Amino acid sequence: MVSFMTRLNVADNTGAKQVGIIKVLGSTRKRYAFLGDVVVVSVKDAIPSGMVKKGQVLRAVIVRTKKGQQRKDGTHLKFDDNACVLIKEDKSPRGTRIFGPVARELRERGYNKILSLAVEVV
Amino acid sequence: AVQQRRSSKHRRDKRRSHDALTAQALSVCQKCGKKKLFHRVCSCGMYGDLRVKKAY
Amino acid sequence: KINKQALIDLVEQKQLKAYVPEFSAGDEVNVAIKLKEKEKVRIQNFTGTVLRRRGKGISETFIVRKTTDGIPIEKNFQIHNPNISIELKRRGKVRRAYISYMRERSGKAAKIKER
Amino acid sequence: SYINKPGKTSAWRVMTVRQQVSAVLAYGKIETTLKKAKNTQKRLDKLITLAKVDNFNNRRQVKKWLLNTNLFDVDQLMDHLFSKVAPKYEKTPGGYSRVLKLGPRRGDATEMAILQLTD
Amino acid sequence: MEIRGIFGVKVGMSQVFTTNNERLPITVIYCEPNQVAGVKTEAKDKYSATLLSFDTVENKKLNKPQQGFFEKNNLKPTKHLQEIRNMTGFEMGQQITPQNLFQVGEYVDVSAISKGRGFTGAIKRWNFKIGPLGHGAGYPHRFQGSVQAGRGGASAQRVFKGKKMSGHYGHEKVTVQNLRIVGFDEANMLVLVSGAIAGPEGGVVLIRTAKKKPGVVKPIELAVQTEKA
RNA sequence: ACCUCGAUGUCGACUCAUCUCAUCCUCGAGCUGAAGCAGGUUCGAAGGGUUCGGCUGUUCGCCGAUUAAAGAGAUACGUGAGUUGGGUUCAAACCGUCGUGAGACAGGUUGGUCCCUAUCUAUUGUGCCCGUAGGAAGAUUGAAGAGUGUUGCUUCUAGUACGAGAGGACCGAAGCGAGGACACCUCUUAUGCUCCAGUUGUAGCGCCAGCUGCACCGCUGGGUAGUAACGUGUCUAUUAGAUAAACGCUGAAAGCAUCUAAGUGUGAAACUAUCUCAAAGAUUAAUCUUCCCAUUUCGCAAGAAAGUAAGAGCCGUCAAAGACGAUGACGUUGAUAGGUUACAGGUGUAAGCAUAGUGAUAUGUUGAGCUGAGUAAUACUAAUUGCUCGAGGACU
RNA sequence: AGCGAAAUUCCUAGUCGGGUAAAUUCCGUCCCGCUUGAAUGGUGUAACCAUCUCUUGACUGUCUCGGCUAUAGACUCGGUG
RNA sequence: CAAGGAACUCUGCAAAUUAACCCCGUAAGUUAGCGAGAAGGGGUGCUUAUGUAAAAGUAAGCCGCAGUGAAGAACGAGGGG
């Protein structure tokens, strides 16, 4: 699905355009990062507006996987490109509004502030 | 690689102990007196009381 | 004795439905899905286009594509699944039982509706 | 390990089975190897059971597998199939051909066998 | 131990649904009433076991000694004969239906001979990574792995006993435990058990009470479809 | 300077490792300048793991981000009869230095051949013969064994015990993970070469239409069964016994005190099994059930020739197996394989025809036609009116 | 004179800035240049190099992580060896 | 060959992506010749009519996932020696 050193889109108003993976979190050698799993990442190129520019590193939550995973019910979610959402340390986001739909699986880990500020959910 | 000490005649004999060919089973045709193969036709043709080939 | 290999269908009769509409690749469809996260079941509507329909007697499944904010969404549904309902609103002309071209084209390429 | 014969190919197998079934339909008795005879028996049976209708569609459909022989041309075998082969089988389903096991040769000592039609 | 076992033939895999909107793939096993052949008395042979037979066939199709043995005890002529340790309380000449052993959702284990694989390398047998396919390969580039534990006459000359090597795979008796069976069919004589089931499609499969969790139940009841004309 | 010059192929990387404990982590416990979290140190413990990248030819070393940590080591500083060659280091040439010279300098600098078809041992799988004092078919027991042995996060008890605030548990319960292993392929993708449809060029089937050959399978889009993972389950747990360190009673040698001398206890991923796998070639050859048996009797009674009569083997159709052998089912008393019929799944409107257009084409006849290996019946075809070994149990 | 840790710099993994998450390699500078240096040439240079070196856009099994089919061998059988 | 797209490796080695024709459009630098086919894009099928002598080109219509349908035909931009 999502592997080490992966560039994906930015789906929130943080100023960045491309996000690159730094390392998957959890235990060592996880080798993958699925929906809802937090991952340390960095920015690649950003517009002058925004609270973050080139050079800094953050922790983000993956919200879009192209391969997709099968839910416990039987509905296997799919997406075309890959997106992510940025936070600072806490569950609160670093951006006001989020572009694009977000999966329901975040409810299994919290992040209700992210879903409450979305335009469409699964 | 190759052998480092020569193989004795005993070694080759024990190796070829399995060389003996099996005794192939035979069968007697029901109309042409001969010892043919098994499940197979003889030189005449009647694999059973039924033919297939002309003469050979 | 012996086995029939049709017992797969024989036992599967416990979970089945005979009210599923017919649709292959282009008919405009809608799915109503029920979610259970509170005391009240939440109802979500999902309109869009068909991608594939496949199954033998229980593996009958389909794929629905929609668009939102210029981003496409593919969702896979099991036909025989509680609290999932399907309906057809506008069927259309198709040339293949399975399509895969929508993964790179969106908009200005809608399926022409047949007679 | 370079420069290798093209060897046996899927297209080669199709050509071989077409040639063998055409030859069998031409003469009726063929001495060959056991494996190829067993492989071509399926196509022989399919062609014979398809020939039982004598309509344009199936006759077009059997042109794919057919091929001319030394003694009879393409149209010759095409007419022969529905003239003196298909009418001979109308009550017997399948089993229009059979194989018997010949002896092994001496040059290569392969497995040789004869293939014939139904009496 | 309360271990009890029944044989059957696993015939295919097909998922069924239930309440809570949860997905669970299921496998279908054609069951058959197994006849008791004997019981080893615990005091008589120092171990307790129950021997049964199944897959009945034509009486004359079996060999003479087994036919005579079944004639002596009036046991139905069968093709398969096997026993299970510590199975207690089942006298001879009795027929067993699968409803006497397991509840609707208690823990189960399933055993069967693994499906065949033929000869295979250590790559497909011990998860050994493939050698480098780029920047120079050498005509060997898919290899069993180095084995040498030393060079000389002090820690060498020996290849380790039973180290992973490219060998036979499959066609061996395996077992998977902690299984929750979900479907009974006495009117049709079939069972449906959750999870993947080992064994080739059409082989002999043995269903027993798992020793992992000694009989703890948690039912799973099916949910009937509600949408209809 | 002790074996090697009649050649024991050197650094590092990849894969594969195995072993010790001076323990990196989990675990047990003591002491504390240990209020509690987190700590510092001594002893026990080898069960498992011990990250990914940038610079780097490198091991290092530095750094970035995570984790339970990023263990110290050992084996011709393991692993070229497994891969390469980035280099000390070959023949070409640069510069710097040295030399009056050819030239030299771990001074740096660009390029640059890595041979070997397996004899014995060892190991991984797997067969034939013989033996187990009758023969054969089955089912067992356990002799000695092998593998599996990692933890995290969230919540509750509980903002409780603790500490003045800050801050924040031991002990337990539940859910969710990652890693690895065992399997399986219904659901998701991967492949799916006599499967389906579109399709260019070219040459044929005389020609139109339609089909074939060839152009990697001609290309493309899918896709049967089986094989596969990224997909689905389960496993990592639990308890019992004896113990390391540690913790104790009663009790004296030593009127006291005191875990030890006796008796009697607590107590760790270590250990024995509980889990899984195989196992009577366990010669120390085990147990049980069933089936076959009694032709006086003839050479030097020597169990000598009538000598299986149960079964097994030869050959064949085959795959649930499969390099070969085996294994498993079946040989006209039959469903073992092929063919036929029907259905499944896939492909998606076969070909001809009529209509509309003028013309490529569209519509209806058409949920049609097609389809290797899927499934159930079918003796239509192929497994024959063939051959060999094989019973009176030396004695208890 | 010019140039300068450059193919020349041993202490050097010299300072700083950059490009990256991290830069012994890279580029512009700084200069006790241990031993730079102007015909054994210095400096700059348009085009070119099966030249060396470094960043980077599309691209892909190089890789995370392996799998499937096909042939010809490899395996059995027959002839030579 | 799914997703990632050089994270492998001393080094994007190998392999893959741009390929044929026609039409737009093309920079630094310079010895003014070049760089340049730079870079970056667009159209190619069949039928009808317009069309020169053929092909061009044009407009309309039709088919499909794609239309030099396969085959054979440059991956580039930078700074340094």
Ligand SMILES: O=C(N[C@H](CO)[C@H](O)c1ccc([N+](=O)[O-])cc1)C(Cl)Cl
């Ligand atoms: O000479 C060789 N090996 C010699 C044999 O006497 C010996 O093994 C050796 C190996 C390495 C070495 N060295 O690296 O200095 C010296 C001797 C090989 Cl290079 Cl052919």
